[PDB]
Every structure is written in structure tokens, then in C-alpha cells.
Amino acid sequence: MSLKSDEVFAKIAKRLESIDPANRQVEHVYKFRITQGGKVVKNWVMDLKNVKLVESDDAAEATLTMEDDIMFAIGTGALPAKEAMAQDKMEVDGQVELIFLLEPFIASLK
Numbered sequence: 801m802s803l804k805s806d807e808v809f810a811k812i813a814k815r816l817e818s819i820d821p822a823n824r825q826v827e828h829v830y831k832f833r834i835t836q837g838g839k840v841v842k843n844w845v846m847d848l849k850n851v852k853l854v855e856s857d858d859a860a861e862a863t864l865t866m867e868d869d870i871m872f873a874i875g876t877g878a879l880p881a882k883e884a885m886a887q888d889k890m891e892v893d894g895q896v897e898l899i900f901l902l903e904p905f906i907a908s909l910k
């Protein structure tokens with residue numbers, strides 16, 4: 801069945817369809833890891849080109865690792881991405897700015 805974190809992926813993708821082609825910001829290949837408790841359970845890819853979010857693992861310019869519990873939390877902007885990671889409760893690797901671009905987009909989701 802469909803889980804909570806699932807809605808997140810759908811939200812992000814649906815949000816990408818908003819960004820009009822007459823004015824873009826920053827699009828690139830991102831990586832999303834869904835760890836359950838401490839170990840990975842699946843891979844996720846951010847198709848910023850086709851404007852979709854599929855499940856896959858590849859060498860992306862920016863790697864973002866987060867647990868399911870955090871998927872729905874951050875995805876819905878329920879908790880602060882800064883504080884969340886500040887407590888070493890999240891592992892992300894990539895250009896601060898790059899990840900900072902999706903920060904203001906988190907709210908767009910519900």
C-alpha cells in the first residue's frame with residue numbers, strides 16, 4: 801500500500817510542474833535515500849529534467865539522505881531542515897546552495 805513518505809515524492813514532483821519554463825532557477829540531478837531506522841531501504845532520484853521523481857540510485861551532483869520519518873516531516877515542511885540536521889539526525893552531502901534551493905520549495909508541499 802501507499803505510505804506517508806510516498807506523498808512527499810509526489811508533492812515534490814507535482815511542484816516541479818509549477819516552475820514555468822519562461823523562468824527557471826536551478827535544475828540538476830539529485831539523490832534521495834530512504835533509510836529505515838539506520839540502514840537504507842531504497843533509492844530515489846529527482847528527475848528535474850523531465851519534472852518527475854523516480855526511484856533509482858546514481859552518481860548525482862548532490863546526495864540527500866533522510867529517513868522515512870523525516871521524509872514526511874521535511875517534505876511537508878513540518879520540521880526545520882536546519883535544526884533537524886543540526887542534531888546530526890540527517891546525513892546530506894551536496895552544495896549548500898543547491899540544497900538551499902529546495903528549502904523555500906518545501907512549503908509548496910503539504
Ligand SMILES: CCCCCCCCCCCCCCCC(=O)O
Nearest residue numbers: 812819824825826899902903905906
Ligand atoms: C533542502 C531539502 C528539501 C527537500 C524537499 C523540497 C524539495 C522541493 C523541490 C524543488 C526542486 C527545485 C525546483 C526549482 C528548479 C526549477 O524547476 O527551475
